Amino acid sequence: MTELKQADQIRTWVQSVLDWLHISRVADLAVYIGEKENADLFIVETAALVHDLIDVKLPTIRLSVSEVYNQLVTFGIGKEDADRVIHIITKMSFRDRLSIEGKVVQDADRLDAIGAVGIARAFMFAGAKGHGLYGDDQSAYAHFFHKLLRLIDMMNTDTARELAEERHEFMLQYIRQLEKDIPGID
Amino acid sequence: MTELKQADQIRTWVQSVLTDWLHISRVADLAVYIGEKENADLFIVETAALVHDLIDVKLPDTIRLSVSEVYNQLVTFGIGKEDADRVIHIITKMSPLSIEGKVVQDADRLDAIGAVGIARAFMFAGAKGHGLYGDDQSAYAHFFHKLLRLIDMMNTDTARELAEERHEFMLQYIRQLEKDIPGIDAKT
Ligand code: NI
Ligand code: NI
């Protein structure tokens, strides 16, 4: 099982390149969902680990599709697995953006944007970008209704839909409470 | 009402100075609510709540006021010397406190817990480049080290009651993180 070795190298590489905590969470989740959805677990974990490397959001860090490709083949990963990972990540991040493995990776990514973890990230992002808690259309509170509260209805697989239900319900109890703590938050 | 007009004056001033205001507005509403239940002087409570942050070291240097600047503006705005002195004694102590000072302190701490405290913790982490969890500067660490202890330091019966709901909700939020992120407590 050389795939253990290869998976471990990608983790170190990615951790090096770079948040890592998001990537790690998404990979753990992708592996879990992929197992229940009969996807290729190597592909799903690997795609999860590198799903952010080619994004335009990242500054000096952003890698090219071929840089990522070359690194995987350099680690000894096969052409077909490297090709399939690239098809996943390149299908996932272009401006204004499936197979079993692609759907699982996307689901994992989206699950990480809801629930208690999703709420944390929403407020973290707002803090980083100088945005308000509420009071603006760019605020974190607004983004729950613009985006986060709809994600459950866009999940690809039965397994991700299952996991979503609990995370979605909790975000709702969170919003209800926030609205109670701050009357006129809207 | 002369005090209604003075509070509205102070409100517009503070909002103009800080131009954070949302925190101050929430703290003033909470403080007046507690103050009324506790039979504290409501004008002093509201005024202190409104100016409680203006001298705080955490404000940037382009905005932060000296104590004399706060004092002078209050007096110009028509607050009497004695009331103005009371307000100054509260905010310099915050940055035993008086009865009104304890009410303001409680309101300020209430805003740091519950659903609103959760949001604020994560916003701060994002502002300072700190992680969600995984080290001692992380938001998660900050819950254990500081925010989960605030309920023990509430001054008033009214605040203590309000803090129980908020604290318990924050405990539910932690439980949810622990569930969704296996190993979160040990993660680095
Ligand atoms: Ni992602
Ligand atoms: Ni404050």
> Could you write out the DSSP letters of every residue in chain A?
-THHHHHHHHHHHHHHH--HHHHHHHHHHHHHHHHHTT--HHHHHHHHHHTTTT-SS-------HHHHHHHHHHTT--HHHHHHHHHHHHHHSSTT---HHHHHHHHHHHHTTSHHHHHHHHHHHHHHTT--SSSSTTSHHHHHHHTGGGGGGG--SHHHHHHHHHHHHHHHHHHHHHHHHSTT--
User: What's the gap in Å between the CA of A146 and the closest CA on chain B?
Assistant: 18
Question: Residue B147 and residue B135: Cα distance in Å, rounded?
Answer: 16
Interface residue of B113, B132, B178 to substitute, partner A, most A CBs within 10 Å:
B132
Fold of B95-188: Methane Monooxygenase Hydroxylase; Chain G, domain 1 (1.20.58)
Flag if A119 and B122 touch (Cβ within 8 Å): yes
Burial class (CB in 10 A: 0-12, 13-18, 19+), A159: middle
Judge whether A124 and B126 are in contact, CB under 8 Å: yes
Flag whether residue A65 sits within 8 Å of chain B, measured between CB atoms.
no
Question: Residue A125 and residue B123: Cα distance in Å, rounded?
Answer: 7
Q: What is the DSSP letter of B59?
A: S
Question: Residue B184 and residue B156: Cα distance in Å, rounded?
Answer: 34
- CA-nearest residue of chain B to A114? B180
CB hemisphere CA count around A113 (13 angstroms): 19
With H, G, I as helix, E, B as strand and everything else as coil, classify residue B105. helix
Q: CA-CA distances (angstroms) from residue B116 to A73, A128, B119?
A: 48, 18, 5
Q: What is the DSSP string of B121-166?
A: HHHHHHHHT--SSSSTTSHHHHHHHTGGGGGGG--SHHHHHHHHHH
Flag whether residue A76 sits within 8 Å of chain B, measured between CB atoms.
no
Burial class (CB in 10 A: 0-12, 13-18, 19+), B9: middle
CA of B14 to the centre of ligand 2 (A): 13
Nearest to B126 among A128, A170, A178 (CB): A128
Two tokens at A134? Answer: 């509420």
User: What's the gap in Å between the CA of B1 and the closest CA on chain A?
Assistant: 25
Q: Compute CA B146 distance to the chain's CA centroid, rounded to the nearest angstrom.
A: 14
Domain with CATH 1.20.58.1910 in chain B: 95-188
- Amino acid identity, position A121: R
Range A1-92 has CATH code 1.10.472.50: yes
CA of B175 to the centre of ligand 2 (A): 27
Flag if A127 and B124 touch (Cβ within 8 Å): yes
Two tokens at A166? Answer: 């609990």
Judge whether B174 and A170 are in contact, CB under 8 Å: no
CB hemisphere CA count around A82 (13 angstroms): 17
Beta-carbon count within 10 A of A72 CB: 22
Flag whether residue B21 sits within 8 Å of chain A, measured between CB atoms.
no
Resolution (A): 2.0
Handedness of CA A143, A145, A149, A151 (dihedral sign): negative
* Expt. technique: X-ray
Residues 98-137 of chain A whose Cβ lies under 8 A from any Cβ of chain B: 115-117, 119-130, 132-135
User: What's the alpha-carbon Rg for chain B, to the nearest Å?
Assistant: 18
| Nearest Cα residue to B84 out of B64, B66, B70, B65 | B70
Burial class (CB in 10 A: 0-12, 13-18, 19+), A77: buried
| Nearest Cα residue to B128 out of A109, A27, A130, A184 | A130
Ligand index nearest the alpha carbon of residue A48 = 1
Nearest to A125 among B120, B126, B133 (CB): B126
Domain with CATH 1.20.58.1910 in chain A: 93-186
Domain with CATH 1.10.472.50 in chain A: 1-92
Question: Residue A123 and residue A146: Cα distance in Å, rounded?
Answer: 14
List CB contacts of B118: < 8 A, sequence separation 6 or more. Answer: A119, A120, A123, A174, B170, B173
Question: Residue B36 and residue B150: Cα distance in Å, rounded?
Answer: 22
CA of B13 to the centre of ligand 1 (A): 43
Flag if A124 and B139 touch (Cβ within 8 Å): yes
With H, G, I as helix, E, B as strand and everything else as coil, classify residue B109. helix
Inter-helix orientation angle B99-110/B21-38, to 10°: 130
| Nearest Cα residue to B156 out of B41, B35, B42 | B35
Two tokens at A89? Answer: 């990540």
Fold of B1-94: Cyclin A; domain 1 (1.10.472)
Terminal-to-terminal C-alpha distance of chain B: 57
3-state helix, strand, coil in chain B (%, to 5): 70, 0, 30
Nearest to A116 among B124, B126, B176 (CB): B176
Fold of A93-186: Methane Monooxygenase Hydroxylase; Chain G, domain 1 (1.20.58)
